[PDB]
Amino acid sequence: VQQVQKKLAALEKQSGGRLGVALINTADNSQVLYRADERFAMCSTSKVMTAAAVLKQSETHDGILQQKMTIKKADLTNWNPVTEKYVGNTMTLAELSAATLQYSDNTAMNKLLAHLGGPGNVTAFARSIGDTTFRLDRKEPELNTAIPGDERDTTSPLAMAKSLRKLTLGDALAGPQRAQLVDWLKGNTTGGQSIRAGLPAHWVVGDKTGACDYGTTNDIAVIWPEDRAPLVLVTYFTQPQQDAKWRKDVLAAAAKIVTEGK
Numbered sequence: 001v002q003q004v005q006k007k008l009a010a011l012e013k014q015s016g017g018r019l020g021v022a023l024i025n026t027a028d029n030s031q032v033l034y035r036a037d038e039r040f041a042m043c044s045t046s047k048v049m050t051a052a053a054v055l056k057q058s059e060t061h062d063g064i065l066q067q068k069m070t071i072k073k074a075d076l077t078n079w080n081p082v083t084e085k086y087v088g089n090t091m092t093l094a095e096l097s098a099a100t101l102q103y104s105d106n107t108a109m110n111k112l113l114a115h116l117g118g119p120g121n122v123t124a125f126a127r128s129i130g131d132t133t134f135r136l137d138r139k140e141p142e143l144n145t146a147i148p149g150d151e152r153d154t155t156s157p158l159a160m161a162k163s164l165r166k167l168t169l170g171d172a173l174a175g176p177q178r179a180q181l182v183d184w185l186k187g188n189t190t191g192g193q194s195i196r197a198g199l200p201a202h203w204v205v206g207d208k209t210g211a212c213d214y215g216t217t218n219d220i221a222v223i224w225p226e227d228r229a230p231l232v233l234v235t236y237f238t239q240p241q242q243d244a245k246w247r248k249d250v251l252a253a254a255a256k257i258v259t260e261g262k
Helices: 002-015 043-058 093-102 106-116 119-128 157-168 175-186 248-259
Strands: 018-025 030-034 068-070 090-092 204-212 216-224 231-238
Touching: 002 018, 002 030, 002 248, 018 157, 018 248, 030 157, 043 093, 043 106, 043 119, 043 157, 043 175, 043 204, 043 216, 068 106, 090 093, 093 106, 093 175, 106 119, 157 175, 157 216, 157 231, 175 204, 175 216, 216 248, 231 248
Parallel strands: none
Antiparallel strands: 018 030, 018 231, 068 090, 204 216, 216 231
16 A cells, blocks of 8 residues: 555656546545645546536436537637537537537537536536535636646545545436436546556546646546446646646556556
């Protein structure tokens, strides 16, 4: 265990950046923490709490996920892998949530934020489930500045791990909604070189990555090691240079270190 701590410490030192890790083993509620209470820019990982807020609404508003929103060339941002295919057309909130979570579409995220009434409403949702650390302050793409010392759009590894657990395995969301969030996370297409890369290939994983300024490379996930109790893992990482290159390999290494033998 302290060997795990030594390995994480060495990983961070060799990386030249700041690493934040929080692992929750639901088998016994044990935890592996590294700078777990420190704040890190969430960047696209904030889309999980956002999508979850929409899901929460569907618990009391029948068919909300089928509600349509119009996409216009003017809505496009710096990253629209899915939405650019719908310019001049409509997308359902479910499609927007899927695009946001599985392709990290920025325009999709903004549509969800607009629907919800703004970032503040996502912060409110977080508080409703007991997360007093999480905070969403801006929309896309500004929420990705990840400026050192800035608390806007940040959270801690442990707070995000606990919230991810509550949302996917706990009671923060009702059954159908909980299942939909788990399905969307499992279907993510951008995590291939992150947390997943540090795990045995047949383990089942649901995750949401992040890549923004200051070489900030993030990933939060729920991991099912074969037939054993699921693990909730948050790996956040940021660097000194605003234009630093992303280090998905660092997240993979952190993941292997804390999950080996689980």
